[PDB]
Each structure stands twice: as C-alpha cells, then as structure tokens.
Design a protein around this nucleic acid. Structure first.
Ligand code: DCP
Ligand code: CL
Ligand code: CL
Ligand code: CL
Ligand code: MG
Ligand code: MG
Ligand code: NA
Ligand code: NA
Length: 326
DNA sequence: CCGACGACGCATCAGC
DNA sequence: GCTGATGCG
DNA sequence: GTCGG
C-alpha cells in the first residue's frame, strides 16, 4: 500500500480521539483524511502535496511532514507511552466496551485481559460475549470461508420459508478477499413499509440457525436487527474454525435497494454519500431517500427501483460495490 | 469566523 | 410500566 | 480537524 505509513498514523490518531479524548468529530476527521490518502494513487512526498486533498488540512499536513522526515510522530510516541490512554485503547477492543465503559473500568483498576476475566461479574451480556471471543473476533475471515458461511445461511433461511431472500452485504459484497464479519440483509414479502402480516420473521430465522448450531451466541436481538456469533462446522479431527461476528438486518421488502445500499457500505462511503445528498437537498437512510423541504424537514419517500436510482437523485455516477471501499 | 459534521436499532438507566 | 437520554454498534 | 459560505 503506497501510503500505508501515513494512513496507519492517521488511523491511530483517529482511535486516540474516539477512545481516549471522546472527541467523535476529530475521530471522523482523521478517518476521512486516512480514507482520501488511501485512494490517492501516488506516493506522497510532502505535507503540502497531501493538503491538496479534501479532508487533509494544516494540522495533518504538518504531521505528514514530521512522519516523512523521521518515520515517526512524537505525539503518537507519547500516547503509546501513556498508561491511561494505552489501557483505555486496549479495553475498547472488546466488543461492547466503548470509550465510556473503558474509562470507567480503568478508573476501577480494570486494565488488562486478566482483569476483565477476573471481573466478569461487572460486564453486561454483550461485553461478556465480546470477552469470551476476544481472540477470535480479532481474526479476519478469508473469502473462501465467507462463501461457506453464505451457503449455510442462504440454505437455512430457504428451509424456514422459501419466500425469504438473504443477501450477504458489507465488505463481502464489495469483493474483499477477507472480511471482519458477516452482514446479512433479510427480506420477506409479509414485511413491507405498509404492513407486517407475520410476526417473528427475524426470530424464526435466528432460531433455525441456532438449531443447526451455526449461531452460537446473541449480542442483541430485536424485531429487525440481530447481532450475534456464528461458527462454521469442522470435519473429523479438524481444529475448530474461529467464532465469527454476524449481523442480520430485516428490511421492509419494498425498501430493499435503500437497504442494500446502506448495508453494502463502506461506512465512510455512506457518510460521504449521505453528506453529499444533504448538500443536494435529500436525506438518505436505510429505508428511503426523501427530499428536504424549504425548512429542511424531510418530505415523502421518493420512488426507488435500483441502487442506481439513489445515485441518480443526488447526481453521482453509479459506483459498483467494489468501488465503494472508502 | 463558526456551525455542521449520516442515520438508526437495541440495551441500559434515570425519572416519573 | 412508559418515555427520553446515553452508550455502543 | 476540516471546510464552505
Ligand atoms: N457507523 C456505521 C457502521 C457501519 N455501517 C455500515 C457500512 C457497511 O458496509 C456495513 C456493514 O457493517 P460492518 O461494520 O460490518 O463493516 P464492513 O462490512 O464494511 O467491513 P468489515 O466487516 O470487513 O470490517 O455497516 C454504516 O453505514 N455506518
Ligand atoms: Cl470532537
Ligand atoms: Cl509513530
Ligand atoms: Cl424513513
Ligand atoms: Mg462487515
Ligand atoms: Mg457487521
Ligand atoms: Na485539503
Ligand atoms: Na469495543
């Protein structure tokens, strides 16, 4: 990767601001600069060259100059030395521990993996599962395994009701050679924006995937969103596969294209696109694109029959999923 | 200078 | 119990 | 932290 040293430094700065400083706009600003530098097709030679890119300003250009000249950033060398920041940064790597809980735990003297294991009684359900699979959740998923997982989910949903449609989204749909988790978009004709003609539509799918021992744990579960844990079956005498994170989102069937646009991401791509929509006078969520009125209040949903229709409303050329990895 | 920075589901808690 | 705010994702 | 107006 052409500018990997720079984008790694900006990512570490972003994480510092989110986890330690609890400065979410600085977190998003460093992420935006790292994203625009990541796609820049030249090896950056100066901070001035980088400042030409949108989202890189004076402060980050100065940090890039320091990094290019020395290979390091003093500000980060200090943060890495700092016990409190280091402990907080670590604890947020556990799923369900965010910046607030991480600082609370560090305040109570809970600062290592050992400390967490000893104090399991102070964790909520999600954090408990995140700790149990801390090691597994740090591993990437090879695309070959993503394909096996897709084949299980799609076949088990079909067994519940052949009218379900399950689509694997996220980085998988963008063509990534490895993924951090599996994201599944689910639809069923009995659930539309107009009516819900069947209860338990997500529940029945979750139950079936549990019955065949694919889903192993639940982090959170409502009528439309499931967050949990899953695992591929292994063969005789084979080492078990790592446990993996799985997210399932049931979307109204008539709102599939807004839903698949949202669930394909990337998250930075959606933020860029939704910000552009606002500049163009629309608001986009996972259900609808609506116009903004003279006062800025959302109007009625606009008709959408393809992902491209949403790009057309905001005057963007269509971008295939593989070109949305921002 | 200075306001705005994407949009939302589920879990948890405070206050009533 | 319900409603609203906050955390986390 | 950055940017548009
Ligand atoms: N704050 C966020 C977080 C995520 N998503 C989205 C964009 C996605 O593509 C997606 C699926 O979520 P993931 O967190 O699982 O991210 P990815 O699938 O894109 O990458 P990976 O899971 O490989 O890390 O959620 C979004 O719009 N806003
Ligand atoms: Cl901030
Ligand atoms: Cl460094
Ligand atoms: Cl809506
Ligand atoms: Mg994903
Ligand atoms: Mg996910
Ligand atoms: Na710039
Ligand atoms: Na976390």
């Amino acid at each position: 990767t052409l500018n990997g040293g720079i984008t790694d430094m900006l990512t570490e700065l972003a994480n510092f601001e989110k986890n330690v400083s609890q400065a979410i706009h600085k977190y998003n600003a460093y992420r935006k600069a790292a994203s625009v530098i990541a796609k820049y097709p030249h090896k950056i030679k100066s901070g001035a060259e980088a400042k030409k890119l949108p989202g890189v300003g004076t402060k980050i250009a100065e940090k890039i100059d320091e990094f290019l000249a020395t290979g390091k950033l003093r500000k980060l060398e200090k943060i890495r030395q700092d016990d409190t920041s280091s402990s907080i940064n670590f604890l947020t790597r556990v799923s369900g521990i965010g910046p607030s809980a991480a600082r609370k735990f560090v305040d109570e003297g809970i600062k290592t993996l050992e400390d967490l294991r000893k104090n399991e009684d102070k964790l909520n359900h999600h954090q408990r599962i995140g700790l149990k699979y801390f090691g597994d959740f740090e591993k990437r998923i090879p695309r070959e395994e993503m394909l096996q997982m897709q084949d299980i989910v799609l076949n088990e949903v079909k067994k519940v009701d052949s009218e379900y449609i399950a689509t694997v989204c996220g980085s998988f749909r963008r063509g990534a050679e490895s993924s951090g988790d599996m994201d599944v978009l689910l639809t069923h004709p009995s659930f539309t924006s107009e009516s819900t003609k069947q209860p338990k539509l997500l529940h029945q799918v979750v139950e079936q995937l549990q019955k065949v021992h694919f889903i192993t744990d639940t982090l959170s579960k409502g009528e439309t969103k499931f967050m949990g844990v899953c695992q591929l079956p292994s063969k005789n005498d084979e080492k078990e596969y790592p446990h993996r994170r799985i997210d399932i989102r049931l979307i109204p069937k008539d709102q599939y294209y807004c839903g698949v646009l949202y669930f394909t991401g990337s998250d930075i791509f959606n933020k860029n696109m939704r910000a552009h929509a606002l500049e163009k006078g629309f608001t986009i969520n996972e259900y609808t694109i609506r116009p903004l009125g003279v006062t800025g209040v959302a109007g009625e949903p606009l008709p959408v029959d393809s992902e491209k229709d949403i790009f057309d409303y905001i005057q963007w050329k269509y971008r295939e999923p593989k070109d949305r990895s921002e």
